[PDB]
Structures are given as structure tokens and as C-alpha cells.
Curated annotation (Swiss-Prot), chain A:
It is found in: Cytoplasm; Nucleus. MVP 3 mediates interaction with PTEN. The vault ribonucleoprotein particle is a huge (400 A x 670 A) cage structure of 12.9 MDa. It consists of a dimer of half-vaults, with each half-vault comprising 39 identical major vault protein (MVP) chains, PARP4 and one or more vault RNAs (vRNAs). Interacts with TEP1. Interacts with PTEN and activated MAPK1. The phosphorylated protein interacts with the SH2 domains of PTPN11 and SRC. Interacts with APEX1. May interact with ZNF540. Required for normal vault structure. Vaults are multi-subunit structures that may act as scaffolds for proteins involved in signal transduction. Vaults may also play a role in nucleo-cytoplasmic transport. Down-regulates IFNG-mediated STAT1 signaling and subsequent activation of JAK. Down-regulates SRC activity and signaling through MAP kinases. Phosphorylated on Tyr residues after EGF stimulation. Signal peptide: none annotated. MVP repeats lie at residues 2-51. The chain holds residues 457 to 507 of 861 of the full protein. This is Major vault protein. The gene is Mvp.
UniProtKB/Swiss-Prot annotation, chain B:
This is Major vault protein. Phosphorylated on Tyr residues after EGF stimulation. Dephosphorylated by PTPN11. The vault ribonucleoprotein particle is a huge (400 A x 670 A) cage structure of 12.9 MDa. It consists of a dimer of half-vaults, with each half-vault comprising 39 identical major vault protein (MVP) chains, PARP4 and one or more vault RNAs (vRNAs). Interacts with TEP1. Interacts with PTEN and activated MAPK1. The phosphorylated protein interacts with the SH2 domains of PTPN11 and SRC. Interacts with APEX1. May interact with ZNF540. The chain holds residues 356 to 406 of 861 of the full protein. Required for normal vault structure. Vaults are multi-subunit structures that may act as scaffolds for proteins involved in signal transduction. Vaults may also play a role in nucleo-cytoplasmic transport. Down-regulates IFNG-mediated STAT1 signaling and subsequent activation of JAK. Down-regulates SRC activity and signaling through MAP kinases. The gene is Mvp. It comes from the Eukaryota. MVP 3 mediates interaction with PTEN. MVP 4 mediates interaction with PARP4. It is found in: Cytoplasm; Nucleus. Disulfide bonds: none annotated.
């Protein structure tokens, strides 16, 4: 299983492509991806000034 | 050419002859195999259950 341990004040958005349904869980939950569930990888800005 | 499939045992009679083994392909929903029905050409792209 692929399971991500979500931080407390954080949200992870997934979709079950096998089931045609959308769900996003905020808060400190342990997501459990179905065999065709995929994550919302977020490219975020960082660096000293910004990137 | 006819495909015998299922929970049975076969003994090839003198008339008939084996061609190939035809192992099944596992497919879940939102996934399939592009199948060209060479008897009628029509490619069906059967998805869902295993085919």
C-alpha cells in the first residue's frame, strides 16, 4: 500500500481513477490510496527571495 | 478457429488441432486491451472486467 501521513494543518487531494470519484481530506489523516488513486503533487515556491 | 475456455479438461481429437495457449489478460475498470476482432475487423477496446 502507498499511504501518506498528512500533517495536521494540511490537506491532500486524491482521485480514484478506478471509481470515478473525487475526495480531498484535510487535517491529520492517513490516506490510503486505492490501486488507481493518485496524489496531488504540488510544486510550490521556495528559496530565500522566491523561486 | 474456436476458443474453448473455462473449468474443463480437453483431449484433442484426431480431427482438431491446438494452435495457441491464449492466456487471459487481467483488466480492471478504466483499463482494457485494444482488441481487433479479426473476423470483423472492428477494434472494440474492451475495458472493465478482465478480458
Amino acid at each position: 500500500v502507498v499511504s501518506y501521513r498528512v500533517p495536521h494543518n494540511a490537506a491532500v487531494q486524491v482521485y480514484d481513477y478506478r471509481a470515478k470519484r473525487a475526495r480531498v481530506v484535510f487535517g491529520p489523516e492517513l490516506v490510503t490510496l486505492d490501486p488507481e488513486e493518485q496524489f496531488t503533487v504540488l510544486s510550490l515556491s521556495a528559496g530565500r527571495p522566491k523561486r | 478457429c474456436w476458443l474453448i475456455r473455462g473449468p474443463l479438461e480437453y483431449v484433442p481429437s484426431a480431427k482438431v488441432e491446438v494452435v495457441e495457449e491464449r492466456q487471459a489478460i487481467p483488466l480492471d475498470q478504466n483499463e482494457g486491451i485494444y482488441v481487433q476482432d479479426v473476423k470483423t475487423g472492428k477494434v472494440r477496446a474492451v475495458i472493465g472486467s478482465t478480458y
